């Protein structure tokens, strides 16, 4: 397999998205992206519940809709976030190990 880092002289700065340490290939990141997109549906759910309540309907279930909305939103947000961070770990240690960010 190819080495961990490649030859950069001083003064050279790359465009380095597909590098081996970039979170755009580490699989955790894209799952976290999926879950972060998915979390917004729970915000939609709680808003639908509260809006239906405010005009006097959905009265037998709007508290349950609010509960499932907020818990779905928060668990998707949380596990998607931590998955993003687990994808972005190698780049962070790269940024520590050398002065290079780009």
């Amino acid at each position: 397999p190819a080495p961990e880092r490649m030859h950069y002289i001083k003064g050279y700065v790359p465009v380095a998205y597909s590098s081996p340490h970039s979170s755009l290939e580490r699989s955790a990141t894209w799952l976290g992206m999926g879950f972060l997109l998915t979390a917004l549906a729970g915000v939609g759910a709680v808003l639908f519940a509260v809006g239906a309540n405010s005009v006097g309907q959905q009265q037998e279930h709007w508290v349950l809709y609010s509960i499932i909305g907020v818990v779905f939103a928060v668990v998707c947000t949380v596990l998607g976030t931590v998955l993003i961070i687990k994808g972005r770990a190698p780049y962070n240690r790269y940024v520590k190990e050398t002065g290079r960010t780009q």
Binding site: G34, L37, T38
Partner: protein
């Protein structure tokens, strides 16, 4: 092909989430502008769509795990790393147009529902696909 294989898990997770959400919602929620009950078209459609993206993501990942570090998947590749053979490509072929004509005859037979047209169109289609797939292998004439 790492990023390509991995970015198929965004839509997979999303479409699976929307499938389960849509299913539970259409069976349990009630509003005055629809009748309660699980909506089967959108259910099957979303789960099979997540199946398609799952299929591509999993096959491409299972391939990626045993392909070498290619120059086109490398940030500082030299242009001379892909020097050599790239592969075989068809230079010319009359049989694509032939196949379109076979499918046209079949489709017009289906339109009018003439049985002989359907038979002849299916015969033409198997013939033209076969001749397409035998193009670069036909023997030299032995006389």
């Amino acid at each position: 092909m790492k990023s390509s294989a991995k970015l198929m898990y965004g839509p997979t997770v999303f479409m699976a989430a929307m499938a389960v959400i849509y299913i539970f919602a259409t069976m349990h929620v009630s509003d005055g502008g629809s009748v309660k009950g699980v909506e089967w078209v959108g259910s099957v459609a979303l789960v099979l769509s997540a199946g398609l993206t799952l299929m591509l993501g999993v096959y491409l990942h299972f391939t990626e795990v045993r392909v070498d570090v290619l120059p086109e998947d490398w940030e500082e590749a030299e242009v001379a790393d892909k020097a050599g053979t790239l592969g075989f490509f068809s230079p010319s072929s009359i049989w694509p147009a032939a196949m379109s004509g076979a499918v046209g005859f079949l489709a017009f037979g289906v339109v009018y529902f003439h049985y002989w047209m359907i038979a002849v169109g299916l015969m033409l289609l198997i013939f033209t696909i076969t001749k397409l797939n035998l193009q670069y292998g036909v023997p030299k004439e032995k006389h």
